[model samples]
Target: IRLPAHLRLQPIYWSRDDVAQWLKWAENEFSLSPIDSNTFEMNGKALLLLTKEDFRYRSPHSGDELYELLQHILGSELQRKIMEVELSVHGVTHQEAQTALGATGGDVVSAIRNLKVDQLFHLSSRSRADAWRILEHYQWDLSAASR
Candidate 1:
């Protein structure tokens, strides 16, 4: 089976051969029917089609390696949140996460860092509890002063 175009460009960085293994494993893990091609496209654009299920199906060692790569590119926190969202949300998936990162022109870590530095501006109009949660997740000290 072949990977979708979007998956081909993932930060997962697996080679074509590695992707082949992932496809083979995904069929078994996800109970998917056999697919013939490796290319996927949407509206004339190549779409990354790998799902969270696909990644989860791979060997733990490979999963860990990919996780490390994810962390390196997205940072531990964002990576964690992205994967969390993928797992917990009904429709959100790795594709959405990649779109989020790709929105910054493929520089997610830098954009994340900027968001950290501009934390106050980022939260000013947001809910206090939500803001605090965000800050706490990033290990920023919670303010003692009452909101």
Candidate 2:
């Protein structure tokens, strides 16, 4: 039988391996040391229940950072759609969009809203580089002078 929509956020996505592969990818994405995949032995849903403090029990290094990554995974279709839109709208590479989502804590609106609340229009005009640039700056207080 086919799975429910919630059951499969991404067409090719899996369950058990979700936690395993995500951890593996995150370590590299964040430039942290490799994590023992066997250490998790859980699904992404279970991983979502975990907090930064809970993660600290897993490892001293990438624990906290991994917490944020897990939360977004659970964001499901919304998260993936946002990443896709971020790419097409800005003509950024998929890699750039993912990092942009990651940088804005999975909410580019807040970051873009910062521009409204706070040049960033200019960010879209320049090469995808501008969006990528402020994303780094946004990853900080969530905003800075548009590059």
Candidate 3:
């Protein structure tokens, strides 16, 4: 299933060589072996057949979203800045922050603004005045932007 654009996040997509390397590592570490065209055996026990589609279907954070994020290449500095805003404003871990930033085209301020509005509308249980007060507590610097 496709993840909504807003939910997609990943650092980088794995290449064929990367997948091969991972398989080699698994074979060495876990004594895994291919038992059939589609199945594998590890420690004499049949291992679940893993495919890209299956991996996406089983994603905890929505596989489709992760895939979308992986599809793009980003510099480390930009990623770090995005993560900082994500952590501060969204209270999410790096992975989540990355996805959120990707959704907003790496615009952290825009993402934070969206999040603030969301919190005001749906997240907080406090009175409107109280929620606005809480939101106003944080200063949003919207000028002097960069890519």
Best by TM-score: 2
* lDDT digits (tens) for residues 1-147 of candidate 3: 233232223323333444334334434444433312122212110111233464354443343432332333232345555545655664555665666677888888766765554546465566765554555564543221111
Colliding residue pairs in candidate 1: 2-38, 5-47, 6-47, 6-48, 7-48
Q: Model 2 misses residue 48 by how many Å?
A: 1.5
lDDT of 2 at 15: 70
* Sort order, lDDT high to low: 2, 1, 3
Which is the winner by TM-score between candidate 1 and candidate 2? 2
lDDT of 1 by residue, 42-92 (tens): 211111234444434543334434334334434434444455434433344
Q: Write the per-residue lDDT of candidate 2 for residues 51-125, one digit (tens) a residue.
A: 578787787788877776555545544444354435334345455555556667767655344333223445355
User: For every model shown, what is its TM-score relative to the native structure?
Assistant: 0.25, 0.40, 0.30
Weakest 10 consecutive residues, lDDT, candidate 2?
3-12
Which ranges of candidate 3 are over 4 A from the true structure?
A: 1-76, 124-147
Summed backbone clashes in each candidate are 5, 0, 1
Residue pairs in steric clash, candidate 2? none
Best by lDDT: 2
